[PDB]
DNA sequence: TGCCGAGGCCGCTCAATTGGTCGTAGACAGCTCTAGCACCGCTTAAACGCACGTACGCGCTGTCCCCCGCGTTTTAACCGCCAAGG
DNA sequence: CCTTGGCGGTTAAAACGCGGGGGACAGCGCGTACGTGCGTTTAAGCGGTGCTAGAGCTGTCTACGACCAATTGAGCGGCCTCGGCA
């Protein structure tokens, strides 16, 4: 997850990050929406 | 360990394709189909050799 | 009208909420001034005690622990919060 | 299961409440009181979610379900 | 004595007293019994836990009063069976 | 919504004491609750008398009904001495 | 006065409540509970009458005052 | 009704005088107040009874009433 | 000695002001309802004393189930290893 | 040479047996003040006309504030200038 706060703000936006996968010439990202 | 697999099968009710998820519990021989859309659930027995196409086949016969 | 009435809440935004809440078909001329005055009194009575308790305890800011300790103490307004629960999370 | 509400968590809660010594037949009762409280609040939270055509029970559905019991919750 | 100590401590603090993970599992289980795979905002579960713990704590206050009324220091089933009845819960 | 005015009254009542960010959401849910309770009660009042306009008199009665005792007295004195200062 | 709430009328209420035996100090404690209940309901009934610009407390003002305590009264 | 209705009316008018003056009452208003008051007292006595029985006390005492009222949130 | 912090100027989006409908809200009259407040006759209901009884409470006993501490140990939940494939 | 299928290794604490030692549950004794059914006498309670009018019920009339439609002014965010602490 990209932290909005230091582990104090680090400039983060708080969003969780996706697991990006390659499928030929296309890239797919799977985000885990907030078990 | 359970297997959570996405499939490219069409739900027999809501007709959304690529939205059926198959959960195969081999420790208890219980397979579970789930939609991701309308989320209808269907349970059926599985062996050790079964695959998402085996329970999805049993779901087609359970309707007809 | 807020400075003219020498108040701190906007009679306007609250009036807009009343229009959006559709609590009636038509408001009065001085009904939102009374409601903002009354609301303003309740906020300046709760935060007056939170600011009295932050300096009585010695705290600098106002935490939700200060709100939970005040509103369930202070029998003046503890009756308003008989059935409330500040989450503290 | 309801067994996740353990013995020392009910004991801790009792300590917060002001209980000194606690008899054994109180955890099950609490487990049975807590389950009734959740079955009364989650029913209304699921009713607000099904009314809002959602699938995710937000925290405002829980605040509305607690508001329908005279248990207003501030901070959400 | 240690009991008293804990009461002085817990009443002083406001952190949740039930373990998060376990509570999340209980809520999702119960909810699963009404509607299958219901997704939850984290704040929804947090709301449920705050509400549940406040409820249980208050219940334990009343229960304590019921035990003390009967000249007892230990809370039992007859206490809750009384507190909840007078509350109109049962 | 109402969070910008809670800090503005706090600058008058305690210009030295600050407030947190969760306590601002608590005071904002408190204000939106006592607003949607007073307006709701007032709406009930305007229906029981078959009126159509919420005047300041249905707000003064909903304050007398909702707030118990001295908070209602003080609540009705501040609204009256704000409407009179408004009309002048 | 509150003394019109006679000893045998509280005794009758207690009997209607299922009480077998009554101590000699319930009588002044029940009048102090009844006076608080009337001071809480009549305040709201007088508030509805002063809001309705009347001078006669009707029975619907009493029904509304009991409705504001979770004591809905049918038949008026 | 178990209370002399007239006494409930007197007491009522007295208490009411302390809130608003020169008040008049419909007879049905007083009757409503009496039904409500007596229902309330009866229920309270049920709960009090339960408290007494809880404390090996089937016979209500002021202590029992106070416990009942405290748990009711009164 | 000099650039990022703060106040000012130019755009954005929503709030404030004005004019025509428009049915619903306020006035007002005719008129009957049940609440108005004063007196009878009778009666169900209420004020005050009794007394031996059942309930309410204090004190001592049994044994007994929660009280406090320690140790790994296990689910649940976070971080690294077996040896098959493509 | 690299990344998943199931598997040890990774913690805060409780799954608490169980060793120790005592607070306190429920039955049992005694023991006293209070306590209601029955008894008296009563002062208010239930039901009937007689009288008198307040304002609800329902009717049509006259009426002033909001709806949605074109103007247009102030608060706020993105450029852009000014200025003393390091
Ligand atoms: Zn489907």
Author numbering:
A (entry chain A): 147 to 153, 163 to 189, 194
B (entry chain M): 15 to 78
C (entry chain c): 21 to 109
D (entry chain f), G (entry chain b): 25 to 100
E (entry chain e): 45 to 134
F (entry chain d): 36 to 123
H (entry chain a): 60 to 133
Lines quoted from the article behind this entry:
To reveal the mechanism by which EC traverses the H2A.B nucleosome, we determined the structure of the EC-H2A.B nucleosome complex paused at the SHL(−1) position by cryo-EM single particle analysis. We conducted the transcription reaction by the EC with the H2A.B nucleosome, and the EC was intentionally paused at the SHL(−1) position by performing the transcription reaction in the absence of ATP. Under these conditions, the EC was paused at the position 42 base pairs from the nucleosome entry site. Surprisingly, in the EC-H2A.B nucleosome structure paused at the SHL(−1) position at 4.8 Å resolution, the cryo-EM map corresponding to the proximal H2A.B-H2B dimer was not visualized, suggesting that the H2A.B-H2B dimer proximal to RNAPII is dissociated from the nucleosome (EV3, EV4, and EV5). In the SHL(−1) complex, the RNA nucleotides within the RNAPII catalytic center were visualized, identifying the RNAPII pausing position, where the leading edge of RNAPII was located at the SHL(−1) position. Therefore, the proximal H2A.B-H2B dimer dissociates after RNAPII passes through the SHL(−5) position. In contrast, in the previous cryo-EM structure of the EC-canonical H2A nucleosome complex paused at the SHL(−1) position, two H2A-H2B dimers are maintained together with the H3-H4 tetramer. The proximal H2A.B-H2B dissociation may occur because of the weak association of the H2A.B-H2B dimer with the H3-H4 tetramer in the nucleosome. The reduced SHL(−5) pausing and enhanced run-off transcription ratios in the H2A.B nucleosome may be consequences of the proximal H2A.B-H2B dissociation during the RNAPII passage. During transcription on the H2A.B nucleosome, the RNAPII efficiently passes through the SHL(−5) position, concomitant with the dissociation of the proximal H2A.B-H2B dimer (right model).
